[PDB]
Amino acid sequence: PELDELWKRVKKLVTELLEQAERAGDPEEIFKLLEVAAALVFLAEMFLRLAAIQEKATDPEIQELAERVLRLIKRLLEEAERAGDPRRIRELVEVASQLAFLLELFYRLKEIQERATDPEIQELAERVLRLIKKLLKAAEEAGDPRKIHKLVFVAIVLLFLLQTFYRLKEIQEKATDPEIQRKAQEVLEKIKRLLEAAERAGDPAKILLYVIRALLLAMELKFAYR
């Protein structure tokens, strides 16, 4: 339903960009048009994640965020379809494709959740998704795509942090090297604290700073494990 009307819109915009790129132009102008059409096709590839997101086993908080993401994508595409400035279409499609990448991450979270057996890690997932919902609400009220970009970027990096939280628990559940276990526990304790700070931060740029600190910490452990 919603997919086949978002794909119709994506289809229309892609062919208009292909036609404009197939007409006369310099290389840099054709390539920038084609970068927009490519990002639009990536968008459609992200839409294919919804069937798995919208399936019955998926966590309902994930489903509601993905629906907010699709509405925002719809809004920016409509804005792109009536914009005429090429830099405006490029910026609007770019932010729509960042939003679309959240669907990939939401789908990755869905898969990682149905495999994880730790109930506390499930609960930490829910306070993160509640922060993402806050970020998405602010994006839904912004008129400036650059303001949307910022809030979505924090949401992307937050989702990646949740991914590294599942991964580090998996390492902790399975690593037999006792020093890997020692460092995993140390990193998880630090990341939990950094996530609580980001959840109390209010300022999106402070959220992003804490999240990046947590990701750098988790990455030190992931590189140590392999």
Add this chain to the structure above:
Amino acid sequence: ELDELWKRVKKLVTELLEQAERAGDPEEIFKLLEVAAALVFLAEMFLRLAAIQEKATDPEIQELAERVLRLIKRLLEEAERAGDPRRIRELVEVASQLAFLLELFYRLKEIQERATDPEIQELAERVLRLIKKLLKAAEEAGDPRKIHKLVFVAIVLLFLLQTFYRLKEIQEKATDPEIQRKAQEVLEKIKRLLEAAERAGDPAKILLYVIRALLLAMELKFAY
């Protein structure tokens, strides 16, 4: 080598976080953290290299992945040398687009492990040799904006080649004889578009053929 790349990434991120802390304007802060995050994304892409270097992986994939890591190392050394924040942001961004190829090379590896349609392999080697030409020309480019263009075509090419594979899965495992025959017809047009890409002189023309082929594959994917 991976341990030395991570050390450089770690160094660049901490410098960027320190600047983000020392910056006062919220727009510059966010731009600096975007660069730091992109560096972390790049370390995560490095973690895909051990599966890529496994004995089962296509050696064409392995050779390409080592060209990508060479490009990335060069950009990180340049980012560590530059002083301009804007220049560091462009260099890091292109390194991170390069890093994404490692994700796409990993995924290609996985799909190639379940490749019941053998004809793909000769076709995929032609794509990979097209991607090698792009990556070889990227290594000789120097201009980070020209590396970005060559890398962008390689990314979409790899995405097309990945999509070329899941069409074969839809072909062999579809019930509807029309949907299963469209998959086989789409795959033939994609071969002709790839053939046109292999003889094209400029990356802009390659990209246009690859987007035409992706559009064709995507239309099939949305049909089922």
